[PDB]
Design a protein around this ligand. Structure first.
Ligand SMILES: CCCOP(=O)(O)OC[C@H]1O[C@@H](n2cnc3c(N)ncnc32)[C@H](O)[C@@H]1O
Length: 638
């Protein structure tokens, strides 16, 4: 069943059903005219002439948009709003402790970004240098990111929940010259030891590139200090000039890297450039959230993830919006926190994740108790499939049956929304991402690469480029080709499956590759296997996901110990804590299945479908030793 577009949205919407159809058609039939005009959402220092210049061809994957144009992202997100909107709040910051908040005007944000841009330059950071940012959800994380972009440095934001080992790996791969961090993060009443984690990471002997660590005194806790290397945020910024002239960057200058888990190996740095990325971020934000001047917008995603890059910071600031940055979690101190934040700051647009929605739904009316929620006009969901029932609960309880829900499918590699409703254009189906965005040509293919027509299911590919597309993997364009453009030739393979219904609506069913989705976190099964195998007692490991009401998927690890070793309950917690140390809490296995019965072909291939099935609780429906299946079932029952 479809939800109709409500009258209030019809009355204000930037894109109606007719306009979506018209614009979508032009975007496909004439990308140069379409994106040529749409690119004017940004200010350009030297105008572009070329618009679309892309290829997905074998051996010739090359993605360029607006390539002869120049611009500055920070001028688009800050400077150009100053004359008329300097006094407008750019960032509302809400502390974990509600007694703590700030409204940061465009003018104040610009001033600090200029100070910090000069701070970076004075420290010897140059255009093209990579800067690691390992920060909690505080406004200074935004300042750091915007200052890096302003001077053309390439920020690489590392999610604050990653372990020292995970932080070291990212620093090593990117050759980061500087780490920006805080003494501690504050989340749900608890402290995260960020600087200490940096300290431990930098002790890795393979870290050779870091010259300084800039530290924000957030809590003022006791921390170790390395004289010469470590520098206090306040001491530097107070000394810095508030005057900084932005310089022209080429459209195709690198903007940021984000380490992203894949089907094979360890996370790789997904690279975005400047022009097409920002155009796409601004355009998707504006149209999908139907943003009007004055709308208070709140995306709940951490700055450490792509959603935080595109839809907490860059898209909203480019459009001159007020964006809310929340330090804490949607359910602390109480499940009603998210809606208390909504009421306190009169949020009109809320964009959150199914894991959060499921967590609040489990508490029922405790999630809305004593809250009003009337300021909301638009709801959004991102990061994982949303089951219809959760969708309906979100729509009914948070939106009060008054707000369109925009379920936005996309990925780190795509820069911005790819398949999504537009609230005044597209009638909603609970659990469906609905239609492709302007410039996006999706298709479904079988495992052999044959396009599947009509209402059908298959491997979800995108058959042409779009401005927000990631341009390479950091220092490895050949792997970029292999990973995304070799399975289905001349096509971008998302690694997701999807069904398309009779209306042409897409229903994304999840990864078809060996990538998990655990509480909205994208994780490779292979990286968890490597982390497990690095443990001195463990010989072999096979990791699969299982359905989980709360997390969406849980991590189920089949583990073979070195010959001579025997399991114990102490070993269970030891191995869990080991993975917590190797990667972080986000990757901790929910189940450890001690076995000597890993199911291998005669060649040595591990049969993963059976392990997936057994772990899910299936008892029904090539192997070197076929009697392993029986043993595995028995052990699963224990
Ligand atoms: C979009 C921000 C998260 O980016 P990441 O690159 O970390 O994760 C991308 C993957 O998350 C899932 N995913 C994301 N959005 C949806 C969605 N709306 N529905 C179903 N699955 C989704 C899809 O499987 C996708 O391949």
């Amino acid at each position: 069943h479809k939800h109709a577009i409500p009258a209030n949205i019809a009355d204000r919407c930037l894109i109606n059903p007719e306009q979506y159809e018209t614009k979508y058609k032009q975007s496909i039939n004439d990308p140069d005219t379409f994106w040529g005009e749409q690119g004017k959402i940004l200010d350009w220092i030297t105008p572009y002439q070329k618009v679309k210049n892309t290829s997905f061809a074998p051996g010739n994957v090359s993605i360029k948009w607006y390539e002869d144009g120049t611009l500055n992202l920070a001028a688009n997100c800050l400077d150009r709003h100053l004359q008329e909107n300097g006094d407008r709040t750019a960032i509302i910051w809400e502390g974990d402790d509600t007694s703590q908040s700030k409204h940061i005007s465009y003018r104040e944000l610009h001033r600090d970004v200029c100070r910090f841009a000069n701070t970076l330059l004075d420290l010897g950071i140059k255009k093209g240098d990579v800067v690691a940012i390992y920060m909690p959800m505080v406004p200074e994380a935004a300042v750091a990111m915007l200052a890096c972009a302003r001077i053309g440095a390439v920020h690489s934001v590392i999610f604050g929940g990653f372990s020292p080992e995970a932080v070291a790996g990212r620093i090593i791969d990117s050759s980061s010259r500087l780490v920006i961090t805080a003494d501690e993060g504050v989340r749900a009443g608890a402290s995260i030891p960020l600087k200490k984690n940096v300290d431990d990471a930098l002790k890795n002997p393979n870290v050779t590139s870091v010259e300084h660590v800039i530290v924000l005194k957030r809590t003022g806790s006791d921390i170790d200090w390395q004289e010469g290397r470590d520098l206090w945020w306040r001491d530097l910024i107070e000394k810095a000039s508030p005057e900084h002239q932005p310089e022209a960057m080429n459209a195709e200058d690198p903007l940021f890297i984000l380490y992203t888990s894949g089907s094979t190996g360890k996370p790789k740095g997904v690279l975005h450039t400047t022009g097409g990325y920002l155009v796409y971020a601004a355009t998707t934000f504006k149209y999908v959230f139907d943003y009007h001047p004055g709308d208070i917008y709140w995306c709940t995603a951490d700055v450490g993830w792509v959603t935080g890059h595109s839809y907490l910071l860059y898209g909203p600031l480019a459009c001159g919006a007020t964006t809310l940055m929340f330090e804490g979690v949607p359910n602390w101190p109480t499940p009603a926190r998210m809606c208390q934040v909504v009421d306190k700051h009169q949020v009109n647009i809320l964009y959150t994740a199914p894991t959060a929605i499921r967590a609040l739904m489990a508490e029922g009316d405790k999630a809305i108790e004593g809250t009003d929620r009337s300021s909301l006009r638009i709801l959004g969901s991102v990061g994982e499939p949303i089951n219809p029932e959760a969708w309906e609960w979100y729509w009914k309880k948070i939106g009060k049956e008054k707000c369109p829900v925009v379920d936005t499918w996309w990925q780190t590699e795509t820069g911005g929304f790819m398949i999504t409703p537009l609230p005044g254009a597209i009638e909603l189906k609970a659990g469906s991402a609905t239609r492709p965005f302007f410039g996006v040509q999706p298709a479904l293919v079988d495992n052999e690469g044959h396009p599947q027509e009509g209402a059908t299911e298959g491997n979800l590919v995108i058959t042409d480029s779009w401005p927000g597309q990631a341009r390479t993997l950091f220092g490895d364009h050949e792997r970029f080709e292999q990973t995304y453009f070799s399975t289905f030739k001349n096509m971008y393979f998302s690694g997701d499956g999807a069904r398309r219904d009779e209306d042409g609506y897409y229903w994304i069913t999840g990864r078809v590759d060996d990538v998990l989705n655990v509480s909205g976190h994208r994780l490779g099964t292979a990286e968890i296997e490597s982390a497990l195998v690095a443990h001195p007692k463990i010989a072999e490991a096979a990791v699969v996901g299982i359905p989980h009401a709360i997390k969406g998927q849980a991590i189920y690890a089949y583990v073979t110990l070195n010959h001579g070793e025997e399991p114990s309950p102490e070993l269970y917690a030891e191995v869990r804590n080991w993975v917590r140390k190797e990667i972080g809490p986000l990757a901790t296995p929910d189940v450890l299945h001690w076995t000597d019965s890993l199911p291998k072909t005669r060649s040595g291939k591990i049969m993963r479908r059976i392990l997936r099935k057994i772990a899910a609780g299936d008892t029904s429906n090539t192997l070197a030793d076929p009697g392993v299946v029986e043993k595995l079932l028995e052990e699963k029952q224990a």
